Amino acid sequence: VNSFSGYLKLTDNVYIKNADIVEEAKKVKPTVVVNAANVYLKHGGGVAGALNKATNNAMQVESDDYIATNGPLKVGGSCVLSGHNLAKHCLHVVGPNVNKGEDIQLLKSAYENFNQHEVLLAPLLSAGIFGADPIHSLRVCVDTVRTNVYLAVFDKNLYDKLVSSFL
Numbered sequence: 001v002n003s004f005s006g007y008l009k010l011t012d013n014v015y016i017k018n019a020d021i022v023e024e025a026k027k028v029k030p031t032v033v034v035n036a037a038n039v040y041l042k043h044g045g046g047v048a049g050a051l052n053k054a055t056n057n058a059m060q061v062e063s064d065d066y067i068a069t070n071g072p073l074k075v076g077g078s079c080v081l082s083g084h085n086l087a088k089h090c091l092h093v094v095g096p097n098v099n100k101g102e103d104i105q106l107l108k109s110a111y112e113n114f115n116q117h118e119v120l121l122a123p124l125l126s127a128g129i130f131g132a133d134p135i136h137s138l139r140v141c142v143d144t145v146r147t148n149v150y151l152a153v154f155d156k157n158l159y160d161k162l163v164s165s166f167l
């Protein structure tokens with residue numbers, strides 16, 4: 001049993017809810033919240049900007065030190081950093097950004113990072129301002145992630161479309 005509430009069960013391991021990942025993280029304090037990161041960990045907008053704003057910019061300060069030491073992530077890659085006030089850990093995952101021309105096949109590699117964690121609160125990778133089709137992102141998530149993932153979908157209209165169209 002875990003603390004996640006109000007989710008619709010899609011599969012054995014994937015759950016979905018219309019919720020802001022920031023408000024959900026604040027309520028649950030999950031072991032792992034996933035950030036929709038870019039390779040530079042520049043948390044300007046979308047999930048990354050809202051998460052970072054909720055940490056009072058502490059996520060960005062930590063991220064800048066990580067990049068200064070390690071250099072940029074790979075598209076499809078990830079790193080584990082602090083969850084600050086939102087979670088124990090933040091798994092920063094880089095899905096391909098279609099609005100930068102990145103290979104959508106890298107979305108499966110991105111979701112494979114989730115398998116290193118038993119339970120996660122996450123957004124749909126490469127959705128929103130990353131430009132991918134969220135229906136596609138949910139299909140790759142279900143077909144790739146084997147650990148227990150609780151997906152937060154901010155947009156109520158999109159949530160309803162994801163549920164209604166789910167095979």
Ligand SMILES: c1cnc2[nH]ccc2c1
Nearest residue numbers: 020021047050123152154
């Ligand atoms: C998905 C879930 N929660 C969010 N909060 C801000 C953006 C976003 C996207």
